[PDB]
């Protein structure tokens, strides 16, 4: 799904394959993905 | 599709069914739709 969808103190790495500048998107928000913010992993808690 | 996708001098009516404030989204842009900007019609040219 083009919509990435984050719990509150969660964050995911977006693979900007225009630059592969993988950057943490500190949540939470309804971040929207073009294929320039490609998500890598899951909403796993990361205690 | 959640992504609405507009040619240059085109525009579509987004049905904000939180308010049904149908407003013209004068293009062009990769406008993204929550179900608060519900698209109504097609990318037909509208001469």
From Swiss-Prot, chains A, B:
Q: What is this protein called?
A: Major vault protein
Species name: Rattus norvegicus
Instruction: List localization entries.
Output: Cytoplasm; Nucleus
User: Disulfide bonds, which pairs?
Assistant: none
**Which modifications occur after translation, per UniProt?**
Phosphorylated on Tyr residues after EGF stimulation. Dephosphorylated by PTPN11.
Q: Per the entry's comment, what about the domains?
A: MVP 3 mediates interaction with PTEN.
**MVP repeat ranges, renumbered to this chain:** 1-47
Range of the intact protein held here: 5 to 51 of 861
Q: What is the protein's known function? A: Required for normal vault structure. Vaults are multi-subunit structures that may act as scaffolds for proteins involved in signal transduction. Vaults may also play a role in nucleo-cytoplasmic transport. Down-regulates IFNG-mediated STAT1 signaling and subsequent activation of JAK. Down-regulates SRC activity and signaling through MAP kinases.
What does the subunit section of this Swiss-Prot or TrEMBL entry state?
A: The vault ribonucleoprotein particle is a huge (400 A x 670 A) cage structure of 12.9 MDa. It consists of a dimer of half-vaults, with each half-vault comprising 39 identical major vault protein (MVP) chains, PARP4 and one or more vault RNAs (vRNAs). Interacts with TEP1. Interacts with PTEN and activated MAPK1. The phosphorylated protein interacts with the SH2 domains of PTPN11 and SRC. Interacts with APEX1. May interact with ZNF540.
């Amino acid at each position: 799904e083009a919509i990435i969808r984050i719990p509150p103190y969660h964050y995911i790495h977006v693979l900007d394959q225009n630059s592969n500048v993988s950057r943490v998107e500190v949540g939470p928000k309804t971040y929207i993905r073009q294929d320039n913010e490609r998500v890598l992993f899951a909403p796993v808690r990361m205690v």
